[PDB]
Amino acid sequence: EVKLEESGGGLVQPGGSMKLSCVASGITFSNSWMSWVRQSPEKGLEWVAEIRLKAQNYATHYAASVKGRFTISRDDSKSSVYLQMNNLRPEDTGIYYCTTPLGGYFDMDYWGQGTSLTVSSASTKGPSVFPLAPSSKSTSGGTAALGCLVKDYFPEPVTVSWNSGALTSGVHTFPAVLQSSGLYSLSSVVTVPSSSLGTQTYICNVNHKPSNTKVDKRVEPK
Amino acid sequence: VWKDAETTLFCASDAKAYETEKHNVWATHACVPTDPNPQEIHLENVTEEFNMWKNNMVEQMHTDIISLWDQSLKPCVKLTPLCNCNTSAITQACPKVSFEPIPIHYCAPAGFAILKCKDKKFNGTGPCPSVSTVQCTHGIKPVVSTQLLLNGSLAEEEVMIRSENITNNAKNILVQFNTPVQINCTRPNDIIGDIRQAHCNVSKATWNETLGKVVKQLRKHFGNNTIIRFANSSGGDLEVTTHSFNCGGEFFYCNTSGLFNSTWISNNDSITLPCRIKQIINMWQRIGQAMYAPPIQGVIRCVSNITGLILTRDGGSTNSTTETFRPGGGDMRDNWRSELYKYKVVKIE
Amino acid sequence: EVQLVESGAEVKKPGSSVKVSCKASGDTFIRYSFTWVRQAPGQGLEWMGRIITILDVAHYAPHLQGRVTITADKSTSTVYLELRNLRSDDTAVYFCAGVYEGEADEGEYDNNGFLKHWGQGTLVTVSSASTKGPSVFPLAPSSTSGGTAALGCLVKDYFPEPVTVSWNSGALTSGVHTFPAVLQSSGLYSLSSVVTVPSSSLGTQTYICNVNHKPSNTKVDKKVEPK
Amino acid sequence: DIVLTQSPASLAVSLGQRATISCRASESVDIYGISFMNWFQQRPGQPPKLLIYAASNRGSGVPARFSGSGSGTDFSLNIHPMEEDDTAMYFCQQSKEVPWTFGGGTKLEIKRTVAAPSVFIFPPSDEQLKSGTASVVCLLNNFYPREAKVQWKVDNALQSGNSQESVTEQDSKDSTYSLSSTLTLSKADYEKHKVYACEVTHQGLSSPVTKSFNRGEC
Amino acid sequence: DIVMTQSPATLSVSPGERATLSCRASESVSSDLAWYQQKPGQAPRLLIYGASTRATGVPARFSGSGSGAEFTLTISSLQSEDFAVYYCQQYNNWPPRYTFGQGTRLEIKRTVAAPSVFIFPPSDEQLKSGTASVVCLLNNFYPREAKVQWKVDNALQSGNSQESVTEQDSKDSTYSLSSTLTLSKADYEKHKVYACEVTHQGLSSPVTKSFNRG
Ligand SMILES: *[C@@H]1O[C@H](CO)[C@@H](O[C@@H]2O[C@H](CO)[C@@H](O[C@@H]3O[C@H](CO[C@H]4O[C@H](CO)[C@@H](O)[C@H](O)[C@@H]4O)[C@@H](O)[C@H](O[C@H]4O[C@H](CO)[C@@H](O)[C@H](O)[C@@H]4O)[C@@H]3O)[C@H](O)[C@H]2NC(C)=O)[C@H](O)[C@H]1NC(C)=O
Ligand SMILES: *[C@@H]1O[C@H](CO)[C@@H](O[C@@H]2O[C@H](CO)[C@@H](O[C@@H]3O[C@H](CO)[C@@H](O)[C@H](O)[C@@H]3O)[C@H](O)[C@H]2NC(C)=O)[C@H](O)[C@H]1NC(C)=O
Ligand SMILES: *[C@@H]1O[C@H](CO)[C@@H](O[C@@H]2O[C@H](CO)[C@@H](O)[C@H](O)[C@H]2NC(C)=O)[C@H](O)[C@H]1NC(C)=O
Ligand SMILES: *[C@@H]1O[C@H](CO)[C@@H](O[C@@H]2O[C@H](CO)[C@@H](O)[C@H](O)[C@H]2NC(C)=O)[C@H](O)[C@H]1NC(C)=O
Ligand SMILES: *[C@@H]1O[C@H](CO)[C@@H](O[C@@H]2O[C@H](CO)[C@@H](O)[C@H](O)[C@H]2NC(C)=O)[C@H](O)[C@H]1NC(C)=O
Ligand SMILES: *[C@@H]1O[C@H](CO)[C@@H](O)[C@H](O)[C@H]1NC(C)=O
Ligand SMILES: *[C@@H]1O[C@H](CO)[C@@H](O)[C@H](O)[C@H]1NC(C)=O
Ligand SMILES: *[C@@H]1O[C@H](CO)[C@@H](O)[C@H](O)[C@H]1NC(C)=O
Ligand SMILES: *[C@@H]1O[C@H](CO)[C@@H](O)[C@H](O)[C@H]1NC(C)=O
Ligand SMILES: *[C@@H]1O[C@H](CO)[C@@H](O)[C@H](O)[C@H]1NC(C)=O
Ligand SMILES: *[C@@H]1O[C@H](CO)[C@@H](O)[C@H](O)[C@H]1NC(C)=O
Ligand SMILES: *[C@@H]1O[C@H](CO)[C@@H](O)[C@H](O)[C@H]1NC(C)=O
């Protein structure tokens, strides 16, 4: 099976530097053109850089918005492609994907899940996670709701899972909102059978890659 | 134990002393008979390094074939330049002689051996774990031809793509086929038609399949993209801009625009290539021009199989999206390297 | 086909050299080979040499190898013959000739040895003699028995050839015989022109011979009268 | 560069009907009779997924309701009949020459029948309370259309300025939305009042629904 | 050196009849053999090449045959314009050393015709110039073969005369001939009777024409 895996994102101040990495498995990497493409917080797609093969003298090309600031490279022996980013600017914020081939002739391509990059100068902070406890005054026939409040973190994004990924049906994890404090907050909720509330354990798993922190919070009736 | 070194090799051949054909006479008065008991001793636990593009056997065979063509073919007029620029002119009788290349083995003298790599996927340069030692290479027909390679050896399993440096668009590339493609060149006899007009017929189905295999191996080597059009040679003499070879002493120059139209972005007539018989030729020995005699009477027939070819890359794939190759040739050292790629001379220590 | 036009007549002293030219028009110059052939007066054709125009390679007859040069100017479509160390026996008419060889520019070359197209010829006279006009003397009719009388003009001691003779400014041609010139031991030429006319016409009809020798720009009219 | 003008930016189609997304290129993307244009689907939080390659070729495993057409400078992606799990971002990408360029994107959504929200209210946790702030959460689950009025009242006082709303993406399976409204108060302000109430007005409700609690009442 | 020999030297054929000219080579020349026609005062004209291939513009009545070292030119019916000199040419060797035959003169065969003989004494102007030319004219005779002798006072002269002969006449197929005797004025005035004697097939006996000086 073919997989691309990006890593290396995080928070950097304008003018600072970061290096992204992408490792390929299950593919003959030396015979693949590799590109980096980023997606704005606005959710539009912008191609960033491409690197070709040894026979094309590893020719590299960069979008004008990044020319002279970013450098793409590859290590065929380690099936990896890299993006060194210098003199970063606010407009470099986004989710960065590695992909192949993405050009001309086609029938199948491959993309990683992406790595997130944020610009700015604001200091980091992991979220506070509070339970949204199922309520005697807040259910319906069967079906009750519970959740986790993920408050006061910076920057985006956080991911939330339930029961280490075993609980996916009925889960809604809302987009974050920026508070007047400059920190983000969101809730993740799930509906479950209310007859299960005394039987089934529910734990939300909140990951915040920018702070390299993980919090698990068990959500019980109050 | 051995060392990488070169020496003055000699040649063996099954040439007939009674044959008036010039290759036979040359291999008789310049080479010994073939090895009556040839042997190939495999080497256990021996990984040897080979490099076809830096082999002295290629230059030795090139000089031997230059001597053969100088002692054999008798043109009517010879012209050798030097560039004030002025040349010379040599004049002599030009009779029609029989011409047909014969297999020629190259043997090493005492204290030297010939290491041969047995890797079916040996791409030309690098290591080889399946090595054997011999004294004489197998019979190689010195078919002097441009663009196409005739009467050569075939690849074992997959189509082989070799080049001194595929990264450099200046260095040529050679493609050795795994399956041969038949080609029947004919100059018919009564007064109808031009005296120099001839045609080579080739089945388009087998050529189509082999060209698909060749572009697929190109992809496997690098790219997988759009092998565009496949055009003809861009400028140059008539020897490089068209398939130039020799049949029965007549110099055939054939138009190869019919087999060069590969609009492949991803993926019962026959192909008839026209040919002209040129007497005023530019010799491949860089020694100027030579004018020969008119062709003989009757039909002129040559049925061979293409076993490989030579191309040149136009480095446009770096900044664009397509990949351009053009027919090459000229330097017959590449023609000798297409058969002397797996052999190398070693000094016994 | 090609039209070959040669340069004009030459007069040379022994030991000199001469260079004659031949313009080829009407076809692809480099697709033809060209040959020079000479013919001494009263003798036959003699092959001198041939240039392979496309290759710029000339071959020469063994007897003169060393003192003959054949060249071609591809930019003016002109062929040249040079003959050095001229001898009296080199006096001849020199013909330029050529033949189509095939698509020479495409390496086709028949190497034809025959000669399809021919120039008009160039007289080359090699002699120690200097140019001089002829003396013209009358050959007066006598008492030429019968009903026909003979008269003429002796055109003597001129050099070089040719001389032209007419009668009555071209009005009299019937019965005219203008003999080929002979070379005298002095190195000057001589010929006679005669005409037979009715004997009853002497005394009433005047007969004047017109002799023109272009090399020395001489023109003489000589009345030939009975007695 | 080859600029791609994708239209419309936002598209709503009824289930069972055709969704048509356009993409105009600033110059031809054809080479030798092949149009090197692609279409991708992207679901929230996921990478782009190739739907159409070379203008008209369905990707392996792409459902038959997806098709592509066009040539030269004018292309369209057609989904018919559109299904509910087709709500997503869609993009047009030219693969003719570098620099590789993308359309501005189309958000494909869907009109469905009215669905009333389920309403839940959550008091602040004791853990959060000790920190010094109180967040009260009102949840509207699985409703359609997106328009809804969520009004906070604290001892009958209509709140304004101290709440924030967030809305989910249209659900891929039931085509509904969910929405959270979060009221943020200081601990002291939260302790000043007794009754916290969320009133929800929505086309699917014949009478706006209030969920409420008395502070501290389990 | 390949030597080409043509035969006969002169061929006399009556108009409208067949003519056969032979060309021999000193060694084999295969089929590299050409035939040319040349009329007085004109350039040669290619007739045949490759031993048997007619050049463009050559009537079908011309045909070549032969190979090796022996070749034949046949003209099936001689027209007025076919009477000329014919040459064969070898171009077989390489390096090229091409050679020509010495020619065959093809003339018109007509009935015998005796010459009309006229004698001209020197003119007074030339005698004043210091030399004496005596001219004997043989007019409109056939065949070309003719003997002219000068006698000065019965003494047979040798080494002091020159002959010239015209081309065959295009109207009556006859020839004409001049013989010019040149001596100094002193020798001219040293003798009395000057006579030219003509021998020809058309004359039963030699014809003598003479004059007495003064
Ligand atoms: C790659 O290898 C192939 C071999 O498959 C070569 O192809 C052959 O080419 C040669 C010459 O180029 C051909 O030979 C010609 O063969 C004719 C066969 O004719 C008859 O004679 C045999 C004799 O036993 C009879 O059995 C048969 O029934 C026929 O009666 C010969 O006649 C030819 O001789 C002609 O040319 C010579 C040239 O000097 C003349 O002197 C002769 O008089 C005559 O005109 C000639 O020998 C052969 O037929 C081709 N096929 C095969 C299967 O061998 C390719 O040439 C080679 N590649 C290159 C680049 O050379
Ligand atoms: C080899 O074969 C090819 C094709 O089999 C030969 O090419 C042909 O080349 C001629 C060039 O004169 C082309 O002719 C054209 O003239 C028109 C005039 O209007 C012009 O508009 C065209 O663009 C073109 O130049 C002809 O189309 C082309 N193809 C064919 C089938 O005839 C080629 O000449 C041969 N020789 C070599 C050395 O390649
Ligand atoms: C195009 O690139 C692919 C890179 O994966 C080449 O791929 C593989 O092809 C070999 C052929 O023997 C298979 O054994 C592998 O399993 C393939 N790998 C994958 C990941 O698909 C391919 O050879 C290249 N050239 C083409 C397709 O012409
Ligand atoms: C054939 O295979 C060999 C593998 O040995 C290729 O050689 C390598 O050459 C490149 C030059 O760009 C080096 O970067 C690699 O390190 C070499 N490989 C090893 C294992 O040393 C060679 O390019 C291939 N192609 C040809 C035509 O020889
Ligand atoms: C073209 O291909 C033929 C294929 O038969 C070659 O003939 C040889 O054919 C015999 C058939 O019994 C095989 O055993 C040999 O292995 C073939 N030799 C080779 C080198 O392929 C023929 O030699 C080939 N070359 C030509 C005709 O020039
Ligand atoms: C050859 O190498 C193999 C391992 O690759 C080893 O097991 C074996 O003993 C070796 N044999 C000799 C003769 O060196
Ligand atoms: C091949 O050519 C490229 C470009 O000309 C050059 O950068 C590279 O070093 C070359 N490699 C070899 C092994 O010659
Ligand atoms: C001649 O060409 C045809 C056409 O491909 C081929 O089938 C045949 O084998 C060739 N040789 C002979 C001797 O016919
Ligand atoms: C090659 O094909 C042409 C076209 O049909 C045909 O005339 C010719 O005879 C063929 N020659 C051979 C050797 O097959
Ligand atoms: C070449 O072969 C491929 C695969 O069999 C086929 O699709 C194509 O139509 C062929 N083309 C020709 C010209 O034979
Ligand atoms: C290809 O052949 C054509 C003849 O049609 C010639 O004009 C051209 O120079 C050749 N080379 C190319 C197009 O690179
Ligand atoms: C590609 O662009 C580079 C500039 O980065 C230039 O140096 C090179 O010559 C170009 N190559 C081609 C084939 O256009």
Numbering used by the authors:
A (entry chain H): 1 to 52, 52A, 52B, 52C, 53 to 82, 82A, 82B, 82C, ...
B (entry chain A): 44 to 126, 195 to 300, 321 to 398, 411 to 492
C (entry chain D): 3001 to 3143, 3146 to 3229
D (entry chain L): 1 to 27, 27A, 27B, 27C, 27D, 28 to 214
E (entry chain C): 2001 to 2214
Per the authors:
The envelope glycoprotein (Env) on HIV-1 virions mediates cell entry and is the target of broadly neutralizing antibodies (bNAbs). Soluble native-like Env trimers have emerged as a promising platform for HIV-1 vaccine design. The N terminus of heptad repeat 1 (HR1N, residues 547 to 569) was identified as a major cause of Env metastability, leading to the design of cleaved, HR1-redesigned trimers or UFO trimers with removal of the cleavage site between gp120 and gp41 (19). First, we identified tier 2 mouse NAbs that were elicited by a 60-meric I3-01 NP presenting 20 HR1-redesigned BG505 trimers.
To gain more atomic details of the M4H2K1-Env interaction, we generated a gp120 core from the clade A BG505 Env to complex with Fab M4H2K1 and Fab 17b to aid crystallization. A crystal structure of this complex was determined at 4.30-Å resolution in an orthorhombic (P21212) crystal lattice. The structure showed that M4H2K1 Fab bound to the BG505 gp120 core by targeting the C2/C3/V4/V5 region. A total of 865 Å2 of the Fab is buried on the BG505 gp120 core surface, where HC and KC contribute to 70% and 30% of the Fab-buried surface area (BSA), respectively. The tip of the HCDR2 loop is deeply buried (348 Å2) inside the pocket formed by multiple parts of C2/C3/V5 and makes most contact with Env, followed by KCDR1 with the next largest BSA of 193 Å2. A hydrogen bond network at the interface appears to be formed by HCDR1 (N31), HCDR2 (R52), and HCDR3 (Y105) in M4H2K1 Fab and T278, R350, K351, N356, S460, T461, N462, and S463 in the BG505 gp120 core. Overlap between the 19-aa-long HCDR2 loop of M4H2K1 Fab and LCDR1 of VRC01 Fab suggested competition between M4H2K1 and VRC01-class bNAbs for Env binding. The crystal structure suggests that glycans at N276, N339, N355, N363, and N462 and amino acids I396 and S463 may be involved in BG505 Env recognition by M4H2K1. Glycan knockouts (KOs) at positions 276, 339, 392, and 398 and the S463R mutation exhibited only a negligible to modest effect, whereas glycan KOs at N355A, N363A, and N462A and the I396R mutation significantly reduced or completely abrogated neutralization by mouse NAbs. These findings suggest that glycans at N355 and N363, the contribution by a glycan positioned at N462, and I396 are critical for the M4H2K1-Env interaction.
